[PDB]
Amino acid sequence: GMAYLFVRLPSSFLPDEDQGVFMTMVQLPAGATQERTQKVLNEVTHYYLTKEKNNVESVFAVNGFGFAGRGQNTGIAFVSLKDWADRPGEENKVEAITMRATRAFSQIKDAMVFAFNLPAIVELGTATGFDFELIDQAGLGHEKLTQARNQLLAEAAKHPMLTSVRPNGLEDTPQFKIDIDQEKAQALGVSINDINTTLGAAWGGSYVNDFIDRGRVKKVYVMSEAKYRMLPDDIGDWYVRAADGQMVPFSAFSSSRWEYGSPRLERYNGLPSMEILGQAAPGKSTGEAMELMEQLASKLPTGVGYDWSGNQAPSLYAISLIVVFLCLAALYESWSIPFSVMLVVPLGVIGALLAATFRGLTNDVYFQVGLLTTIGLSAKNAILIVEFAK
Amino acid sequence: GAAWGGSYVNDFIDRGRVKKVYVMSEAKYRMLPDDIGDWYVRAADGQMVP
Amino acid sequence: AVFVPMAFFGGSTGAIYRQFSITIVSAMALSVLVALILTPALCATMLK
Amino acid sequence: GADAKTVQDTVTQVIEQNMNGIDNLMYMSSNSDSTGTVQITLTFESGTDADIAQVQVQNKLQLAMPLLPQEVQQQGVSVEKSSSSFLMVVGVINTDGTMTQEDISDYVAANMKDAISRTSGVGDVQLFGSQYAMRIWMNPNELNKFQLTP
Amino acid sequence: DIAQVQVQNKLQLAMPLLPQEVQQQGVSVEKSSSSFLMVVGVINTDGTMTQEDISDYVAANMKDAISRTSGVGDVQLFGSQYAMRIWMNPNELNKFQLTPVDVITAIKAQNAQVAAGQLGGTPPVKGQQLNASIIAQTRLTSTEEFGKIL
Amino acid sequence: LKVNQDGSRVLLRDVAKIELGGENYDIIAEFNGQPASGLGIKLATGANALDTAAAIRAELAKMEPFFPSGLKIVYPYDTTPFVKISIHEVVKTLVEAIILVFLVMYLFLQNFRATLIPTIAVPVVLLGTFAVLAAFGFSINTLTMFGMVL
Ligand SMILES: CCNc1cc2oc3c/c(=[NH+]/CC)c(C)cc-3c(-c3ccccc3C(=O)OCC)c2cc1C
Numbered sequence: 058g059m060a061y062l063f064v065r066l067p068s069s070f071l072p073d074e075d076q077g078v079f080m081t082m083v084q085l086p087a088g089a090t091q092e093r094t095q096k097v098l099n100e101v102t103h104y105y106l107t108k109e110k111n112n113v114e115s116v117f118a119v120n121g122f123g124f125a126g127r128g129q130n131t132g133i134a135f136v137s138l139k140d141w142a143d144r145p146g147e148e149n150k151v152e153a154i155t156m157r158a159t160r161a162f163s164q165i166k167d168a169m170v171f172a173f174n175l176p177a178i179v180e181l182g183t184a185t186g187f188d189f190e191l192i193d194q195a196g197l198g199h200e201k202l203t204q205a206r207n208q209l210l211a212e213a214a215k216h217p218m219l220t221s222v223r224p225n226g227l228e229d230t231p232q233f234k235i236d237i238d239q240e241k242a243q244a245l246g247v248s249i250n251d252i253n254t255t256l257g258a259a260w261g262g263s264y265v266n267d268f269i270d271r272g273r274v275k276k277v278y279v280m281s282e283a284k285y286r287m288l289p290d291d292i293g294d295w296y297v298r299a300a301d302g303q304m305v306p307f308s309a310f311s312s313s314r315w316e317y318g319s320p321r322l323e324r325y326n327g328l329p330s331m332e333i334l335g336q337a338a339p340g341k342s343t344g345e346a347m348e349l350m351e352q353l354a355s356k357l358p359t360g361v362g363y364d365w366s367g368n369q370a371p372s373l374y375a376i377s378l379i380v381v382f383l384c385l386a387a388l389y390e391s392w393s394i395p396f397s398v399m400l401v402v403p404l405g406v407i408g409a410l411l412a413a414t415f416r417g418l419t420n421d422v423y424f425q426v427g428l429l430t431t432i433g434l435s436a437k438n439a440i441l442i443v444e445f446a447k
Numbered sequence: 448g449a450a451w452g453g454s455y456v457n458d459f460i461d462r463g464r465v466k467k468v469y470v471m472s473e474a475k476y477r478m479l480p481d482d483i484g485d486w487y488v489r490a491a492d493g494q495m496v497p
Numbered sequence: 498a499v500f501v502p503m504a505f506f507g508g509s510t511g512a513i514y515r516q517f518s519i520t521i522v523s524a525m526a527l528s529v530l531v532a533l534i535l536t537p538a539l540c541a542t543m544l545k
Numbered sequence: 546g547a548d549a550k551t552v553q554d555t556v557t558q559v560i561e562q563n564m565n566g567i568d569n570l571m572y573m574s575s576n577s578d579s580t581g582t583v584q585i586t587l588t589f590e591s592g593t594d595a596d597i598a599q600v601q602v603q604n605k606l607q608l609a610m611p612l613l614p615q616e617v618q619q620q621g622v623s624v625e626k627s628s629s630s631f632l633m634v635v636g637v638i639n640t641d642g643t644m645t646q647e648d649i650s651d652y653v654a655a656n657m658k659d660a661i662s663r664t665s666g667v668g669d670v671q672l673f674g675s676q677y678a679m680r681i682w683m684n685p686n687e688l689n690k691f692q693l694t695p
Numbered sequence: 696d697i698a699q700v701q702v703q704n705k706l707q708l709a710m711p712l713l714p715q716e717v718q719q720q721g722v723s724v725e726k727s728s729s730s731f732l733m734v735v736g737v738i739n740t741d742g743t744m745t746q747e748d749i750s751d752y753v754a755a756n757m758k759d760a761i762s763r764t765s766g767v768g769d770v771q772l773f774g775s776q777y778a779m780r781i782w783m784n785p786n787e788l789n790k791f792q793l794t795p796v797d798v799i800t801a802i803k804a805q806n807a808q809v810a811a812g813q814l815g816g817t818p819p820v821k822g823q824q825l826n827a828s829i830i831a832q833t834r835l836t837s838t839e840e841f842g843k844i845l
Numbered sequence: 846l847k848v849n850q851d852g853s854r855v856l857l858r859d860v861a862k863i864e865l866g867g868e869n870y871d872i873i874a875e876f877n878g879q880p881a882s883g884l885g886i887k888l889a890t891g892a893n894a895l896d897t898a899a900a901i902r903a904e905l906a907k908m909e910p911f912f913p914s915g916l917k918i919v920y921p922y923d924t925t926p927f928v929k930i931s932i933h934e935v936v937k938t939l940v941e942a943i944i945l946v947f948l949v950m951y952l953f954l955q956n957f958r959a960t961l962i963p964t965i966a967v968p969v970v971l972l973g974t975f976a977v978l979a980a981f982g983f984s985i986n987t988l989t990m991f992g993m994v995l
Pocket residue numbers: 977980
């Protein structure tokens with residue numbers, strides 16, 4: 058019974074608990090604007106300000122900065138809750154706060170908003186979860202990797218003893234491509250240098266020089282009024298100086314067409330790559346799902362490669378069996394005593410598991426050391442029964 | 448300099464990885480001291496100079 | 498004989514299993530030392 | 546200005562290829578954004594001295610520095626200690642003499658921000674806004690009717 | 696570890712005192728060991744390639760990772776990585792009236808990546824629905840593309 | 846910029862709107878629906894954690910009194926009080942464990958003198974661990990504190 062109460066008991070690393078502070082991020086679809094995401098960020102801040110008055114002390118919404126990266130598609134809201142004394146119930150605890158919040162954000166919205174407890178541990182080591190990465194080993198392009206990534210994400214979902222796999226956040230938004238006819242340029246009499254800094258400084262911005270403001274040195278930037286750089290039709294408004302002292306429209310040498318590109322290109326170990334964030338089955342755990350993902354990566358097209366208690370305990374504890382026998386003979390010579398104490402180990406541990414199996418506890422770090430402490434007290438209890446009697 | 452020794456002009460992309468663009472000349476035009484005269488330079492008056 | 502062998506840590510779970518053992522391993526040595534010097538002395542000096 | 550396909554092989558790949566010969570290392574990761582921003586993280590083995598681990602990557606970088614665009618060279622190249630988790634997020638608001646979420650953003654970065662990142666081994670300080678800059682908004686029609694370019 | 700830094704950070708004060716041809720070239724500071732240990736030979740048998748096709752592929756798949764892996768001072772390449780090689784003809788330059796200066800300037804203009812902005816830029820007008828990045832000039836890919844430079 | 850034939854002066858103000866605006870408009874912060882900015886302090890790999898956040902006098906308190914009309918500090922997302930409560934709950938457990946031990950000692954030894962040796966035996970042992978762990982490099986960590994309790 059001691060074995061079954063231990064093998065069937067799930068394994069975790071460190072318990073995630075209330076910290077009086079949590080956060081929530083926003084993710085908008087392909088090519089969304091600052092005005093679009095602010096509308097969603099406003100709704101997130103208010104659910105905390107009106108439907109969570111007794112919990113939330115202060116909010117801190119940020120527009121344009123997520124944790125996957127940054128941009129007009131991203132967003133975050135830092136939350137600071139009222140002190141634990143004024144938050145008595147379990148519903149007033151982060152675990153239940155982030156529950157009904159996600160429920161609300163998944164319902165009365167059209168984008169992607171979550172909520173999570175801050176992993177008091179570290180970014181790494183979630184238990185029953187992994188970080189997969191698909192590498193381009195050959196000379197295949199990003200578009201070719203995308204399809205192989207799509208095939209990997211499909212096959213794991215096709216036959217999931219299941220899985221929970223999703224991409225990192227590459228989206229794939231359309232990009233406005235401009236082709237400048239090189240022959241037409243020098244024919245009309247414009248320098249390619251001039252055209253490049255015309256489009257670059259007007260639509261993106263240019264670091265011109267530094268200036269002084271109230272003592273401190275700051276930067277001088279040049280761009281343009283928004284209205285002249287909002288739509289693809291605004292390209293024609295910009296006229297460039299030619300060698301014959303006259304103006305030339307963009308539409309003369311330019312060519313307007315849309316293209317399919319990616320907002321971010323991930324690179325793992327000097328090669329183009331795409332990260333796959335997936336978790337293990339609701340039944341299985343890491344080691345199983347990890348090797349049950351590597352076989353799917355091997356069943357992919359050519360030129361496509363991959364890279365990623367614990368195994369710790371099986372070792373450590375074995376030495377704990379060797380040093381005991383020595384120290385149980387370093388004061389107790391026989392080959393009789395070094396077997397008397399050896400029994401108190403699972404004598405107490407059964408109840409140690411029982412109390413954790415009965416309650417909502419799991420095989421975490423404190424429990425793993427709560428075992429050896431119990432064993433230490435069990436050894437004490439046993440040794441006195443031997444030392445006195447001997 | 449660019450004809451006899453080589454010149455690091457710019458960088459280009461080849462199969463994903465970024466590589467370099469070099470400019471020089473066919474060996475036969477830079478083998479002997481007599482090959483120096485083959486190179487003609489542009490002057491301000493729009494004509495070639497040996 | 499069960500703590501320091503388990504304090505042989507590793508990876509991210511380094512200090513985690515390490516710190517706990519040595520904290521109580523030192524405490525064991527100090528408790529034993531106290532129970533070898535101070536506790537016996539205090540027990541002899543004034544008990545009944 | 547640059548797109549994700551630009552920064553990937555004019556800033557990133559230049560650094561990626563010129564990133565070798567470092568004692569202790571597991572892997573390297575990169576994110577080339579469309580905002581024209583790239584950041585490369587290098588993870589070392591547990592227990593490795595971060596003081597020297599910083600140098601090795603930042604002094605090998607400064608050999609690909611002249612292999613980068615001068616727009617990037619005059620921009621913020623930074624090598625810092627990673628910790629993807631905030632601790633002190635100090636909010637600065639106004640009540641009486643009302644100012645904008647840009648007037649504060651400048652004053653925070655022109656009185657405090659400079660000292661904070663320096664004070665007591667802070668890896669990097671995040672600015673929630675921007676410091677003031679001499680902003681010029683060019684008019685294309687007004688450039689044409691006078692015959693001028695940016 | 697520190698002995699390296701001291702010489703490499705004092706060097707980087709004479710860096711702008713050097714030719715720009717040297718500045719864009721490989722300045723390197725590494726750990727000395729005038730003795731090889733692992734000299735891994737890479738040959739071809741079936742799909743026959745030259746002692747230049749291999750030299751490139753070795754330096755475009757392996758070499759980059761090796762020097763980085765497990766504190767390797769420097770990695771020696773027995774050959775060279777591929778480069779866009781152009782062999783100029785002096786007679787063909789004359790009969791058209793041109794110089795290598797014009798050739799370099801042609802590549803330094805037609806073969807480049809240009810940082811173009813985006814629709815719905817950093818500061819938009821409150822009410823925009825679209826945000827897409829602009830693509831301008833891109834570094835050339837093949838030999839055919841380099842052949843068609845005006 | 847220019848002086849057109851008729852002696853007409855062309856200035857930057859004529860062709861472009863000039864204002865003292867932000868360097869970056871990509872990110873905007875709102876504290877409880879109110880326009881704001883701030884500082885998000887990120888840790889350094891191997892920094893003193895709570896000691897960095899408590900490295901004070903400072904850490905911006907010399908900026909705290911020199912603010913103009915309206916400018917005020919506020920504190921969202923903070924680690925500090927959690928550390929303040931983690932120690933307090935552990936030290937409270939420590940004292941509770943002594944008092945509860947004191948009763949069991951009295952409930953078995955009716956001698957008040959006897960229920961004093963174990964009461965004054967273990968407070969010394971704890972400080973010993975505080976002295977030993979300090980000599981080994983260990984701090985008052987979340988673990989080492991539970992280690993005292995365990
Ligand atoms: C039961 C443990 N008892 C200990 C007794 C000790 O006694 C010491 C006596 C000394 N007398 C000089 C003749 C010197 C110099 C260092 C000592 C150290 C010591 C050694 C290395 C580094 C730091 C310290 C140290 O304790 O200093 C930290 C403040 C030390 C350490 C421990 C653990």
